[PDB]
Amino acid sequence: MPSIKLNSGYDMPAVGFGCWKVDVDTCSEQIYRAIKTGYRLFDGAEDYANEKLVGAGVKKAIDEGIVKREDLFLTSKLWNNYHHPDNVEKALNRTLSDLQVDYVDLFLIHFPVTFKFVPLEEKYPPGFYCGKGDNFDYEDVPILETWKALEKLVKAGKIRSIGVSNFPGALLLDLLRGATIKPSVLQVEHHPYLQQPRLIEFAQSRGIAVTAYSSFGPQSFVELNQGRALNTSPLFENETIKAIAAKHGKSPAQVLLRWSSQRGIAIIPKSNTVPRLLENKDVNSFDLDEQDFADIAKLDINLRFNDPWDWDKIPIFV
Helix, strand or coil: CCEEECCCCCEEECECEECCCCCCCCHHHHHHHHHHHCCCEEECCHHHCCHHHHHHHHHHHHHCCCCCHHHCEEEEEECHHHCCHHHHHHHHHHHHHHCCCCCEEEEEECCCCCECCCCCCCCCCCCCCCCCCCCCCECCCCHHHHHHHHHHHHHCCCEEEEEEECCCHHHHHHHHHHCCCCCCEEEEECECCECCHHHHHHHHHCCCEEEEECCCCCCCHHHHHHHHHCCCCCHHHCHHHHHHHHHHCCCHHHHHHHHHHCCCCEECCCCCCHHHHHHCCCCCCCCCCHHHHHHHHCCCCCCCCCCCHHHHCCCCCC
8 A cells, every 4th residue: 555656756556565585487477466456566676587477467457457567666677787778678577578468667786796698599587607617707898887777768658767786885975976866766675683873864865765675684494594503583583572562462474574664765575475475565563662663673693684795795785
């Protein structure tokens, strides 16, 4: 129901359905199911390797008359091999073709990292393959060159709003100096173990909407192993989160999502189950108070789960 007005003039649903890590074999049906339930924003990306599957679910729902295209907010993200201005449109055309749509509502630069271009006929999506066997290889395309190509695509009608994912403050600040169309959205890893409060305040002060990912902190096998190795509890089991949930008669999941949604940050949880699907859609049924916000703020330990340093020592967050 609630909406964030982007600096581009369009309304972005505050609560969306996250397509990152969705089960491949049920993806189309979950998308359809989610539209039927009332979800309108779908947060996707070229790297998720499921945009055809998302487009088929979307297609089904539009065909049965449940929603019109203009009612949906489809986000995709430009992958790291496609930053050169010759190639940004090739990537975006594949997204649009996969999604079976004529525009996307939001197209983000996925990471400030420039992998060497790989033809889409060779491998798609390429992931960490950079055309040099198992080795990473990079190309010298400044962020602003990519941004200017995105701007061109906005003016060509293929994208409504553009933004960035996984940008630190200094890089976002420098982008703002060269941008003609300002970034509308900043999407970052955001949970009580990685709060980055000055980054949030910065983005919000410039009228940039913030979308959180990984609102639940560690969830994958690897992230929960790290957690155990660090003697750090999963957020669902964290004593502060459980105390606040108990206090409000709510689940830890609901406290985690509300923490963000109450501060005006967009959320895109994986809702892979009809129980989660309905709980995650009604997160705004209670308000955290000032003491809750103070208790949660103490949890910040700068624990970052999504770090290109881990890929190839790429210094994005250093």
